[PDB]
Amino acid sequence: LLRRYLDYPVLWKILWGLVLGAVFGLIAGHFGYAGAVKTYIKPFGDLFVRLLKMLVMPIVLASLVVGAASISPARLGRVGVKIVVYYLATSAMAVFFGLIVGRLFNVGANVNLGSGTGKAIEAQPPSLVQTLLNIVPTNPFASLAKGEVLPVIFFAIILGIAITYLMNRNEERVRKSAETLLRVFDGLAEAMYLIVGGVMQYAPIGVFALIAYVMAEQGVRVVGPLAKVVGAVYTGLFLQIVITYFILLKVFGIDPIKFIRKAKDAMITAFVTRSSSGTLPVTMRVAEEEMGVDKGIFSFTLPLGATINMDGTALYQGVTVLFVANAIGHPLTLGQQLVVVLTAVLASIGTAGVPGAGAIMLAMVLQSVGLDLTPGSPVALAYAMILGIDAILDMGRTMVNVTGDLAGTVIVAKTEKELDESKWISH
Amino acid sequence: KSLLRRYLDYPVLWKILWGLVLGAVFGLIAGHFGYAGAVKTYIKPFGDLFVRLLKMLVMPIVLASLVVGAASISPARLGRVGVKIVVYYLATSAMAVFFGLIVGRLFNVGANVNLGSGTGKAIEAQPPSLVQTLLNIVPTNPFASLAKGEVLPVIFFAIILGIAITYLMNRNEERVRKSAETLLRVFDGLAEAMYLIVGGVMQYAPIGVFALIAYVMAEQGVRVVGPLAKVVGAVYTGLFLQIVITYFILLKVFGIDPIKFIRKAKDAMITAFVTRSSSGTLPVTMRVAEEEMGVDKGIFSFTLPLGATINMDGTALYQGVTVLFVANAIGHPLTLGQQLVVVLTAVLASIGTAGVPGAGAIMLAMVLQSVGLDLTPGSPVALAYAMILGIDAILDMGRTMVNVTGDLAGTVIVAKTEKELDESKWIS
Amino acid sequence: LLRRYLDYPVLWKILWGLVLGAVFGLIAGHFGYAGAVKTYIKPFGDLFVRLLKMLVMPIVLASLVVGAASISPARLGRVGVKIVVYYLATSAMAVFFGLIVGRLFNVGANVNLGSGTGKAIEAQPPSLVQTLLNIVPTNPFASLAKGEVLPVIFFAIILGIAITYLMNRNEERVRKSAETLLRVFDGLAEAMYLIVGGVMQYAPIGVFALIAYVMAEQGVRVVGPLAKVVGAVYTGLFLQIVITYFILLKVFGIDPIKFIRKAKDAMITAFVTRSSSGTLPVTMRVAEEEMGVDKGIFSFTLPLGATINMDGTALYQGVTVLFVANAIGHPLTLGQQLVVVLTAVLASIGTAGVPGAGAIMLAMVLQSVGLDLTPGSPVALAYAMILGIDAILDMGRTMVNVTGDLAGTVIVAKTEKELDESKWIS
Ligand SMILES: CCCCCCCCO[C@@H]1O[C@H](CO)[C@@H](O)[C@H](O)[C@H]1O
Ligand SMILES: CCCCCCCCO[C@@H]1O[C@H](CO)[C@@H](O)[C@H](O)[C@H]1O
């Protein structure tokens, strides 16, 4: 049957894995068997996840050294500004859709009570300076072993830049050594991209396994009030994709329907693995094989976007903060909701995509606003209710971000004329 | 001429074996007369230096050789070598179980007298770890596994990288080929440098082998007396039988001269003996496989690091003997079948753990714990285990040495069946 | 102002950062504002420090693999014994100047009281054997990730040596792989040196920010008895430079004023960052571009000197031990002071340059001689006083060491005929 699996056409095969996994998950959970799914099905999904994590640091280091050597510093600076401007614009929309859909569904019509008290807290206050200095790795070997994406990005860019300067120096020995070094990262990045392609042979089984477990454990819990939270958040995702990303792509002359079909492997993988960083090898290959984006762009914008994209956060916090407020009957005006989500968005920036993100962040938000989280308390209850569906929300939060990352990469690539247009011609 | 120059000018063929024999003799005399403390201070640091110089080479030599190795051979054959080497380790561990049970009962370990309370068996609770042990083969951060010195995920990452590299060197784009080849040369350049450094370290090895064996003999030599002398006897007979019967017959079946083999292995065996680490001997075992046995890197760069973590032979022998010793010491009745189930579960539980000093004592303590015996201080089983624990280094040397031998034997066998053995190294 | 900063001539610009920062620091501190300096000014200096730390492990690894390939093992061994002999000579002098200036200033005429009078009551010999064994890394990838310089030096030397053996082999495949490997380290070292050059465009801003903060916090605290401690220590530095380093440079035929002009960037960076290792990328680039030392020399001697140079320690311990003894009125003979300093110096070897060095070591010395460090006690009081100016002393301690490292590197390079004379001729 190993041969019957592989010879089935691979174009949609991963997407079959998703729907069949999700159905199998729901049925298994509804009938009690979510324990069996955890034992027998999930290790196959954990395997998919490990194989992709294995590739993240090599592919990020090697692609960005090769990439940053390939482009001049001035243009790299301009890509940096373009992708940040992009991420501000789209997070502004994400906050908007976060506020609207939460209120449309009017999340939280169940009843606990408390308004407080504090628990009066100040607190930190949230000083970014050390977050910024920490971008510079003090030991680039240590950042690789510890898996720190942002200091590795910084080291890869300066090394890549320096290499190109050396290759333009007069001394031949200097040019040849720098080029040998550049070739090694080219060889390594290339090998990593090859492995991704092989791992993606396994992906439909892995995608099946992961989505099955999530559905078996937390599917049965989407009912009543929490069904409206899932509905609101997923509507928010849908709007962010088909409005914010589609209009911006169209404004810049990219066919948005072509985009989605090229993104699907990145989007589904982001959905089940619930990690922007762990999806990077897939998102980066998609940017290469499918979108036709030059490594000079995506080797920077994608790993950067995996840590700074605020879109999924704004949607999650917008919906879940309202759910908590209505559940405990705390009056929250629209502007006050905006202030809360913005401080959670600002507080989240540096953090890379990691499972269990917004639930941890939501808990911080409730504490900093002075709410009582002691066990048994109404807010502890509302928080626990969100916590129990958190994976179902995490999948959507992660999936909307990688899509936004690809969109912003493709857009900036186009504005730089680093987008290969032949990849977008269909037969 | 100074003492430095006369030491190195002595022919190196047997010099490590003199380091072993003079080290062991020196050790015994020092201990019998009280001086084991001075040995620890003055003699032993030189052996520890040997141990560190070899450890230094394990991750670079294993990574670089396996990328080079896995690039040099096609995936299909690499799978076949994988299955061949696994089947070998099953066969030989069965023989190790067999001799472990036999030699233990022939010597009839125990007949010192305590009396124990309780059993058993096998509850308490198990539980299975096997799936997560397999998933853990895949490193989530290959830089971390290197920095943490994890051999089994480095084996996996090295193979995946090597395979990918030749695919790139066979593609059409010239830059893609040219980069992949540069990358391959970097690992080839590094691997070559490590094998050269091993060669340099082995000039120091007789001194190190001397220092290590002297220390172990001085501390635990005096403890081999009475009942415990029979534990040592049984285990070492187990080794001898496993070598001269199991490894010798298999080597003969596949047409390798078993006497030539031992002469070629001796440096790896002695190094395994004193360092008591399969992983830490790998640079020596891999160089023996190259210079002496004449095995292609496509074979031994895989089978040897894998064998350092999966070889069950030393475990079957240790557990076989010592489990009987505690049972007889506490007068607990143990049928031949009951001993067999215990050794097998200790063997199955041990798979995947690489060779590390203090292995069997830790595993033995687990085996007694899982069968429900009372290890509280003062108790008969706590007493019998403490007796084993005190000679454990002497047993550890034999346990490591038999495994690295079995690793070389299976590597040589698989290499021959693959026609990857250089016959010129063997012709008399 | 982005443009006017860069177009100002770079010749002296870092030293203006130091002087203006130090003046700015003192004034800001005297007026209460050392808190604002910590918030607004210091991150610019911390940024300077991180950018340099980033480069330490790559440049040390790569320069030494390349360097040890470029030169024969025999010469490297002689360079090793020459540089150690150099460090014994100069530390002997540093002990001397430590004892002299401490007593000249007669540090500690303030009055507490208590007397320990005990020796080796801790009690440890101590035992160096494991310290030596620890030179050999058990996992060179681990030592790199942990940033351990001395085992990386060891691994780099043998890898470099092995590489040239392979590049002399008959098999062309072996030769070509080894050369590819050697080119990778050559390419990386080259890139690091290029980046150092860029960071040093920022150095005046960084140097300003660092000296400003230190001056703002501890400048106000150097007064009364503690002013005599700082006076004593900095005179010791001065003498160690203008006497020990200058005479040695002249004995071997190097112009000492030319030397000083060339060393200044390493010296000022050593001064403000208070780390020999963190200054290494700057000290090594200075040895290459300015001194004209071959990489075969400095890629080894300089990282070694960052962990073995005892000059700053001998000076620090000499003065502060006397301050403590006089502050508590404990009679201390000149010979007894010598025995204490040497055991502190022997105890310090192998530790690389790190901020907060001597304060920790002083605390051990007081403890190991049996003095009472419990809160409120005189020695705890005298120790706390030193502790509060420690940064001002640390700057001077690191700056004299990096100077001595460059001095000894240049001497060995000259005796090995690996110094390029065209850089010195003018
Ligand atoms: C431990 C090493 C495992 C590597 C095994 C690789 C799979 C070997 O298997 C072979 O792989 C080829 C790949 O094209 C296939 O063409 C063959 O059908 C298959 O027999
Ligand atoms: C204060 C110590 C300064 C460094 C010591 C200088 C060493 C000078 O002595 C050196 O001995 C070598 C003999 O092998 C020769 O090769 C050198 O030419 C010679 O200068």
DSSP three-state, residue C403: helix
What residue owns the CA closest to ligand 1's atom 17?
A: B76
Which residue in A159, A59, A164, B143 sits closest to C189, CA to CA? A159
Contacts of residue A426, Cβ cutoff 8 Å, sequence gap at least 6: A258
Q: DSSP for B231-244, please give it.
A: HHHHHHHHHHHIII
Which of A136, A137, A180 minimises the CB distance to C187?
A180
DSSP three-state, residue A170: coil
- Which amino acid does the sequence have at B130? L
Token pair in block for residue B188? 């080839």
Give the separation between CA B307 and CA B405, rounded to whole angstroms: 10
Work out whether the CA dihedral C363, C364, C367, C368 comes out positive or negative. Answer: negative
What residue owns the CA closest to ligand 1's atom 5?
A: B79
C-alpha distances (whole Å) from C409 to each of A129, C263, C294, C300 are 39, 12, 10, 9
Q: Which residues of A touch C47 (CB under 8 A)?
A: 133, 136
Phi/psi region, residue B119 (left: phi>0; alpha: psi -120 to 50; beta: rest), is beta
Contacts of residue C261, Cβ cutoff 8 Å, sequence gap at least 6: none
CB count in 10 Å sphere of residue A352: 20
C-alpha distances (whole Å) from B401 to each of A214, B394, C145, C321, C322 are 48, 11, 33, 55, 59
Ligand 1 atom at minimum distance from B82 CA: 1
Please name the helix (run of DSSP H) or strand (run of DSSP E) that holds residue B111, with its range, or none.
Answer: none
Give the separation between CA A178 and CA A166, rounded to whole angstroms: 6
Contacts of residue C13, Cβ cutoff 8 Å, sequence gap at least 6: C204
Please name the helix (run of DSSP H) or strand (run of DSSP E) that holds residue A220, with its range, or none.
Answer: none
Instruction: Spell out which residues line ligand 1, taking CB within 6 angstroms.
Output: B 75-76, 78-79, 82, 159
Cis peptide leading into A123, omega within 30 of 0? yes
Give the separation between CA A265 and CA A284, rounded to whole angstroms: 11
Give the separation between CA B63 and CA B408, rounded to whole angstroms: 19
DSSP letter at A353 equals P
Which residue in C327, C107, C322 sits closest to C231, CA to CA? C107
Give the separation between CA B377 and CA B380, rounded to whole angstroms: 9
CB count in 10 Å sphere of residue C39: 10
Contacts of residue B218, Cβ cutoff 8 Å, sequence gap at least 6: B27, B28, B30, B31, B35, B36, B39, B40
CB contact under 8 A, A147 and B144: yes
Q: Among C72, C75, C82, which residue has the most ligand 2 atoms within 8 Å of its CB, making it the best to mutate?
A: C82
Token pair in block for residue C293? 């030392």
CB contact under 8 A, C181 and B186: yes
DSSP three-state, residue C108: coil
C-alpha distances (whole Å) from B33 to each of B22, B38, B46, B212, B394 are 17, 11, 22, 18, 19
CB contact under 8 A, C187 and A173: no
Cis peptide leading into A125, omega within 30 of 0? yes
Give the separation between CA A70 and CA A72, rounded to whole angstroms: 7
Ligand 1 atom at minimum distance from B159 CA: 2
Q: Is any atom of ligand 2 closer than 6 Å to the C-beta of C177?
A: no
Give the separation between CA B285 and CA A248, rounded to whole angstroms: 61
CB contact under 8 A, C177 and B188: yes
Q: Is C334 exposed, middle or buried (0-12, 13-18, 19+ CB in 10 A)?
A: exposed
CB B279 within 8 A of CB B356: yes
DSSP letter at C351 equals P
Give the nearest chain C residue to A178 (CA atoms). Answer: C187
Side-chain-facing half-sphere of C11: CA atoms under 13 Å? 2
Q: Is A335 exposed, middle or buried (0-12, 13-18, 19+ CB in 10 A)?
A: exposed
CB contact under 8 A, C136 and B49: yes
CB B298 within 8 A of CB B71: no
DSSP three-state, residue A154: helix
CB B405 within 8 A of CB B251: no
Which residue in B272, B70, B78 sits closest to B191, CA to CA? B70
Chains that touch B (3 or more CB pairs under 8 A): A, C
Token pair in block for residue C279? 């200054």
Distance B171 CA to ligand 1 centre (A): 19
DSSP letter at C329 equals T
CB A289 within 8 A of CB A422: no
DSSP three-state, residue B75: helix
> What is the CA A275 to chain-centroid distance, rounded?
6
Give the separation between CA C288 and CA C279, rounded to whole angstroms: 14
**Contact residues of C toward B, CB < 8 A:** 129-130, 133, 136-142, 144-145, 155, 158-159, 162-163, 165-166, 173-174, 176-182, 184
CB count in 10 Å sphere of residue A2: 6
Distance C82 CA to ligand 2 centre (A): 6
Q: Which domains does chain C have, with CATH numbers?
A: 1-426 (1.10.3860.10)
Q: Tokens 């003065």 identify what position?
A: C319
CB B124 within 8 A of CB B372: yes
CB B234 within 8 A of CB B103: yes
- Which amino acid does the sequence have at C127? S
Give the separation between CA A292 and CA A287, rounded to whole angstroms: 6
Contacts of residue C348, Cβ cutoff 8 Å, sequence gap at least 6: C310, C313, C357, C361
Side-chain-facing half-sphere of A352: CA atoms under 13 Å? 19
Distance C411 CA to ligand 2 centre (A): 9
CB B208 within 8 A of CB B54: no
Token pair in block for residue C351? 């530790």
Cis peptide leading into A375, omega within 30 of 0? no
Q: DSSP for C113-146, please give it.
A: ------SS-S------HHHHHTTS-S-HHHHHHT
Mutation target vs B (from C65, C146, C148, C181; most B CBs, 10 A cutoff): C181
Q: How many residues does chain B have?
A: 428
Distance B192 CA to ligand 1 centre (A): 28
Which residue in B17, B400, B25, B21 sits closest to B239, CA to CA? B400
- Encode A381-399: b = buried (16+ Cβ within 10 Å), e = exposed: bbbebbbebbbbbbbbbbb
Token pair in block for residue A238? 């849908």
Please name the helix (run of DSSP H) or strand (run of DSSP E) that holds residue C101, with its range, or none.
Answer: helix C73-105
Helices C42-70 and C256-273, packing angle to 10 deg: 130
CB count in 10 Å sphere of residue B378: 7
CB contact under 8 A, B165 and A191: yes
What residue owns the CA closest to ligand 2's atom 7?
A: C82
CB count in 10 Å sphere of residue B314: 32
Chains that touch A (3 or more CB pairs under 8 A): B, C
Give the separation between CA B180 and CA B186, rounded to whole angstroms: 10
What residue owns the CA closest to ligand 1's atom 7?
A: B76
Give the separation between CA B3 and CA C110, rounded to whole angstroms: 59
Token pair in block for residue B265? 């292995």
CB contact under 8 A, C50 and A133: yes
Give me the phi and psi of C306, to 5 degrees please: -65, -35
Work out whether the CA dihedral B210, B212, B213, B219 comes out positive or negative. Answer: positive
Q: Which residues of B touch C136 (CB under 8 A)?
A: 49, 52-53, 56
Ligand 1 atom at minimum distance from B302 CA: 1
Q: Is any atom of ligand 2 closer than 6 Å to the C-beta of C86?
A: yes
Phi/psi region, residue B294 (left: phi>0; alpha: psi -120 to 50; beta: rest), is left
CB contact under 8 A, B188 and C182: no
Give the nearest chain B residue to A52 (CA atoms). Answer: B140
Give the separation between CA B334 and CA C412, rounded to whole angstroms: 73
CB count in 10 Å sphere of residue A339: 12
**Contact residues of B toward C, CB < 8 A:** 45, 48-49, 52-53, 55-56, 58-60, 143, 146-149, 182, 185-186, 188-190, 192-194, 196-197, 200
CB A294 within 8 A of CB A63: no
Give the separation between CA B297 and CA B289, rounded to whole angstroms: 9
Give the nearest chain B residue to A61 (CA atoms). Answer: B143
Chains that touch C (3 or more CB pairs under 8 A): A, B
Nearest Cα of chain A lies from the Cα of C76 at a distance, in angstroms, of: 24
Dihedral Cα B16, B19, B20, B22, nearest 10 deg? 150
CB count in 10 Å sphere of residue C243: 13
User: Experimental method used, please?
Assistant: X-ray
Token pair in block for residue A217? 């454990």
Q: Is any atom of ligand 2 closer than 6 Å to the C-beta of C87?
A: no
Give the separation between CA B313 and CA B347, rounded to whole angstroms: 9
Q: DSSP for A101-149, please give it.
A: HHHHHT---S------------------HHHHHTTS-S-HHHHHHTT-H
Q: Which residues of C touch B148 (CB under 8 A)?
A: 142
Give the separation between CA A363 and CA A384, rounded to whole angstroms: 10
CB C347 within 8 A of CB C364: yes
Side-chain-facing half-sphere of B291: CA atoms under 13 Å? 17
Which residue in C84, C60, C57, C63 sits closest to C349, CA to CA? C84
Which residue in C235, C239, C233 sits closest to C90, CA to CA? C239
CB count in 10 Å sphere of residue B428: 5
Q: Tokens 């400003």 identify what position?
A: C212
- Which amino acid does the sequence have at C263? A
As a whole number of angstroms, the longest Cα–Cα distance in chain C is 76
CB contact under 8 A, C187 and A181: yes
Give the separation between CA B423 and CA B172, rounded to whole angstroms: 36
Residue C293, strand partner residues? C419
Which residue in B14, B49, B23, B122 sits closest to B366, CA to CA? B122
Q: Which residues of A touch B157 (CB under 8 A)?
A: 54
Q: Which residues of B touch C188 (CB under 8 A)?
A: none
CB contact under 8 A, B56 and C155: yes
Cis peptide leading into C279, omega within 30 of 0? no
Q: Among C78, C79, C419, which residue has the most ligand 2 atoms within 8 Å of its CB, making it the best to mutate?
A: C78
Work out whether the CA dihedral B370, B375, B376, B381 comes out positive or negative. Answer: positive
Token pair in block for residue B367? 């085996």
Give the separation between CA A322 and CA A331, rounded to whole angstroms: 10
| H-only helix segments in B108-139 | 130-135
Token pair in block for residue A310? 């605020």
| H-only helix segments in B225-379 | 226-241, 248-253, 258-275, 278-287, 297-310, 313-329, 336-350, 359-370
CB count in 10 Å sphere of residue A268: 23
Token pair in block for residue A101? 């859909």
Mutation target vs A (from C54, C66, C199; most A CBs, 10 A cutoff): C54
Please name the helix (run of DSSP H) or strand (run of DSSP E) that holds residue A234, with its range, or none.
Answer: helix A224-239
Give the separation between CA C98 and CA B109, rounded to whole angstroms: 68
CB B140 within 8 A of CB B359: no
What residue owns the CA closest to ligand 2's atom 20?
A: C415
CB C410 within 8 A of CB C249: yes
CB contact under 8 A, A133 and C57: no
Token pair in block for residue A314? 């704004």
CB contact under 8 A, C54 and A180: no
Nearest Cα of chain A lies from the Cα of C191 at a distance, in angstroms, of: 5
> What is the CA B206 to chain-centroid distance, rounded?
19
Token pair in block for residue A84? 């940040």
Give the separation between CA C289 and CA C310, rounded to whole angstroms: 26
What residue owns the CA closest to ligand 2's atom 8?
A: C415
Nearest Cα of chain C lies from the Cα of B58 at a distance, in angstroms, of: 8
Give the separation between CA B395 and CA B233, rounded to whole angstroms: 10
Q: What is chain C's percent helix, strand, coil content, to nearest 5?
A: 80, 0, 20
Which of A141, A159, A181 minimises the CB distance to C57?
A141
Which residue in B385, B316, B267 sits closest to B99, CA to CA? B316
| H-only helix segments in C328-389 | 334-348, 357-368, 378-388
CB A416 within 8 A of CB A292: no
> What is the CA B123 to chain-centroid distance, rounded?
31
Work out whether the CA dihedral B180, B183, B189, B195 comes out positive or negative. Answer: negative
Which residue in A196, A154, A200 sits closest to A284, CA to CA? A196
